[PDB]
């Protein structure tokens, strides 16, 4: 008899974007080192945190078993920016604020469609800076073939 | 750009050995600039399709023909 | 290390009338059994189909399966268990007034018949999952085996020329 | 359905990356230093019709490839009387290395080979080098060039390293036909005053510079080469009242690339089809003078399958069908479509065991040295069509042919296989005998 | 004896499945009688004390 | 059709199929020794 | 079935499938630099007309260039059969200049010779369709012709010319239009009254590179291994009725030469490389009462009938030494291209390759005439004794003779195709060797 | 299939067993568990003139002799398994 | 014409057949076509000369499930309460004037 | 007659469809046969009385692999870069004696197209991409009185 | 006037109970089987 | 003269329950079908007028 298999998540490797590394665009900046990028739509509630599983940084819990697929790829959180709990300009606020939703849908708020690794800067501090919740990648609108602006998850 | 972009490889009308017959390289198995009969992916041990450097899998070629390359 | 793969499997089936028997005050499960038997309420019947006896049987089926196989199984659906109990009950129900002796035999038959289906049931499921999960059976060249020619003509293939000795 | 699948929402965005290669800037490979020279060989024995002659290839260069046998013939009649006569003339050629036969071709093989594997302008140019194709008349004199088609005569990649064969000689033995149509005989009738052929054998030699020449001279070498296997047999001749059938043992060995065959009337070289009173199908066809017992020699070949004799065929291995029975037109038209890409004349058939039988690179073979019972099973067409009545021929059905098709009594079965020619310590021969 | 204990099998939690198939006991009689279950009398039909004695009573 | 025969199982069948011991859908051929048989002519003495 | 072949596995399979290296059931692909191609019209400086010299300059619209097609619009000055590749005849020559340096130059005759040797089958036919009238068009008919250029960058993406890297050098093309074109504005020596002047336009196919490739071209130095054509005209040692003329022609060539090519011709009639005769297609009106052997059937100027070719035999000498044994003209006409190209060469056109495959871009053996102080082409001509007006005299003739009209082939054209290096640096380009 | 002999015309067998001609049950149909079993028979058209060999012998699959109308009786038999039990000097069948 | 089938699974999603849960069993339909169809190939008992034969095609509407629903169907047992049609034909007593 | 198909997998071994890898999926070919075929059952618009109905057979050339490769295909995921044909029929902006018609045709295509190809035709006559004329080979009876 | 044959193919199927059906569906099997080998030959023709 | 073909890009957004469409003569409200001389299919349909 041959032993059955579970989710078996598919994870790619982070790439060199010039003086920094980041996860490729169809993927998310999941976990670290062994599992750096998620490819499939769900992944292994990575334990490393702060320590804590949420879920972690860029994915949110779903109502399932098989830890390997308990977080769904492509989300974040309200992430307070300046004085308002807005999603990043390139993110889509679902509307699931928290109070009007159950635990699973309350966490799945920003729908990071087409912006899983990089986003654009925001006119928040009056200076066009990297969103409060992300790392400040050195690229600009003049720089070609790199539409992402200061951002990384 | 930090990429070892090679020269072109077109279908030539003459077979050519790469002058490295004792170590059989894998980059010359898919190079159409030397062979002329047929083209196949290089099989590693236990009949595993080993993709040599420079070439790309069919899914990667589809991603490069639809979405685009990089810099 | 197999904990997760095992944990991953649901323990709660979205079954028609999940929690099918008991969990209702409209009428007892004993009565349902009596009605299909077409027998009067009586100590033999009210002990055999009682919740404590149904529970006894369910626990034995679970425990014995776990003892006999490597598998952990749930309680069985009770329409299936009631129908089986009543079927067995109709074809036997033989006692001289000794309810305890009668019950011992009837429980023996129910537990035994249930295990005759369960033990192979478990096997069938486990083998099913193998096939449902893994391509073809999850096996290798053993399954994808071409016939062996197995004839001797090839033994006579000879060299065309002999090298000089060196 | 409990297996794992992938949504692939952006699988391709994930799988992209940098360019690997650019189309607009070619790098040419630096090659070795060599030169090519065409050198005449000495032919021993008297050359003439029906004679057996031979030549030893002189050690003038290091490696050899192309070999062309020149012949000079004069037409013994007018245009329409000859058909590839220089091809017919070279009845056969045998390649011997170290005294061991490596290969051997026949005039009919050259005709079959050409009919099956050459094409387009190459085939035409070939015909120019072996026949008269511009309506030449009696007495016209031409030099013909018959290229040989041994493995080393097709590619430098298999150049024969004479330099590596210091103890062994390489020879060609050539049989010249006793008769050549339209040159010294018109059918069975000798042509009075016909001239004997002039013959010359040319070998194109490769001269290597020191580093490569030395490696060849000193190192052992293994060349993957192609050999012809061949034998003729009686055809289960079809007739007006019946569909003949025949179980033919295929006495072949080695990893075979393909089988090829034809039926023919041994009377007339290259005749693989029946004769008929339709244009080009017989001498005088289309006119009152038409005779369906003699071909229009200049137009002996045809693509009109109505004149072919194979209804269907299958090949069995170890007594079992290798593929489902297919019609003769499958072997004639489809196999070549798939495997060659040229056009094959009616009466010529192919069954490949290889993806690309026309090339050098192995692409699947049938090892007959491991097969106990290889049999070709043929079913012939009913010979009920009156060949002298075009309507009877042109309007016929799939399962029938010309009454004159029963003259195609000879069957030639050929096979090409891959062996290894090994050279070492100045000597060589085949890796395998069988 | 068939199926050699497969301790490496991961789905050992077969609780979500109902293996009992009570399809063979639908419509049976006391031992082997054939009367289409004979639900004729609209009453309770009490239990008959069938004691497993030999061919005779005593 | 045939499935209804499988379903129609009673007390009477216990002596035929309860606790199966055998099956009709599997045969076992028993491995035997190696031997060969030959027909040989004998010499007849007398007349 | 197929399994019966797979099971037939043994020792002779090891050299074909043991330790497999590739699988034919899986294609491997390469990520190529993204690009696009756009067709852009260039203008013409100078007045377009017969006998005029005009030119263009290729603008830097794209980064690299390859194919160039010159369009012409011509009318028929006579009926079908009066023209022969007239757009090819019209474009008398094209000179390629980079930075003012002459890089290369093609001639109308070269285009004809090139085609005769290297194009084939439907490539050749489709080519003819773009330069001639091949559907029996009549006087007054007008068509657009497309004459592709054959400079090294016009044959493969691999040699796309790096306009991008030539910041300070323009690429120009000078086109000479013939003063007369047969069947268009002249009929033999006679002008055609009312003939229209050609309309001309030069089209260039530009390659647009992505950012990364574009950058490399701008920053890196480049070199290309390219082809050049060397060409001179010579008088033919005209043969005659009583003799086989012979001639030693100095081969004033340099650089690594891939091959030589040559023909003999009648300067009056474009593409005429053979003698005229009263046999179908061999002369104007051939085969009938109106036949003349002073003018060709222009639409059938070319032929594969060698009997009308002038050359008997030839050899190439290097520094007075034979390079190969003397071979017959038919060897250069038929065998050389069989071996080296795989197409069919018309009578009167000859090839001698120094390369294994001269039809390709990859060098495969060259004769470097920069190291041969005195190369010579030695030609022997046939005796011009055959009366061209008597079909039998021609069709029934011998190997060493030709038509009396072969003495009209007074010109000899010798070409040599060689390899040089085009270097690009600091925004400028030019050849490495004189 | 089930016996290996030859059965005379007019006699029909349907087996529920692999080898009904033997002792080992080898498959049975328990009719005590079948609420309503039915044998459904279709008869031939009895239009053949029994007194005329041409009609008797040259006829079609779906027809028979006019005299077949006289075959008015049908006998249906079945063979089944019961258990003969013997105990304490007495015995009989387990199932009634 | 479109003849919908009216089997229990053809009436509601709630009784869809889980082909996914039937790895070792096939699901098949069998269709008997009438020898005669009124006004199409026959008019009462009379055949209609030249009548065309039908073109037939069976279309099945499939449900594609996402990851969790799909997985549960594949691994859990499934029970549906379904309908069946029982049928028998017979001669009527014949009434008369 | 033998009509080869030209789908991507029908052109090269490199794109052979891995039926062994399709444990649960079938591969089908649907073939529509023309209502009429010129010179076979119809002469222009006229049906040909007595014309035969076609006999058809579909042949597939299968590749049998050895054990290691059969297993590989059966177990591993496979991706093949393939070709597809997109096609739409349009009404031609038919030209006339006094005018050069012109037409803006929307190219309702998607994907990385390798090339476009097109033709104009007379739908009446299969394969007719050009006008008819009384010149040899350009019409029925061309070159003569008929 | 000869009629064409009407043909039908019938197969006798074995319906297994749950325990055995499962094993057949799930487990590997080995069956010793018989095969017929056959070739046709020309008979040397005997004569008077 | 032809079976017209069309490919209409649908510039829709949002989670769509269904699509619906019709062809019509914009002249006549609600006309989704062709006119004909059969009862109800045109003004005066079925008669000379």
Residue numbers in the entry:
A (entry chain a4): 98 to 147, 152 to 254
B (entry chain a3): 218 to 288
C (entry chain c9): 5 to 170
D (entry chain f9): 4 to 437
E (entry chain l5): 136 to 193
F (entry chain g3): 3 to 49
G (entry chain d1): 3 to 436
H (entry chain j1): 341 to 436
What do the authors report?
The membrane is surrounded by a roughly icosahedral external capsid shell that has a unique vertex where a spike structure, required for host entry, is located. The outer capsid shell of the icosahedrally averaged PBCV-1 structure consists of the MCP (Vp54) and the penton protein. The minor capsid proteins (P2, P3, P4, P5, P6, P7, P8, P9, P10, P11, P12, P13, and P14) form a hexagonal network that is immediately below (inside) the outer capsid shell.
Here we have extended the resolution of the PBCV-1 structure to 3.5 Å by collecting data using a direct electron detector. This is by far the largest viral capsid structure that has been determined to near-atomic resolution, and the first near-atomic description of a NCLDV capsid. P2, P5, P6, P7, P8, P9, P12, P13, and P14 are present as a single copy in each icosahedral asymmetric unit, whereas the copy number per icosahedral asymmetric unit of P3, P4, P10, and P11 are three, four, two and 12, respectively. Three rows of P3 and three copies of P2 construct a scaffold that glues together all the capsomers in each trisymmetron. The N terminus of each P2 protein extends to a neighboring pentasymmetron and glues together one-fifth of the pseudo-hexameric capsomers in a pentasymmetron. Neighboring symmetrons are bound together by the zip proteins (P11). P2 essentially acts as a molecular tape measure (or ruler) and determines the size of the viral capsid. The icosahedrally averaged near-atomic structure of PBCV-1 shows that the PBCV-1 capsid is stabilized by a dense array of minor capsid proteins (P2–P14) inside the major capsid shell. This minor capsid protein shell cements most of the gaps between neighboring capsomers and uses transmembrane helices to mediate inner viral membrane association.
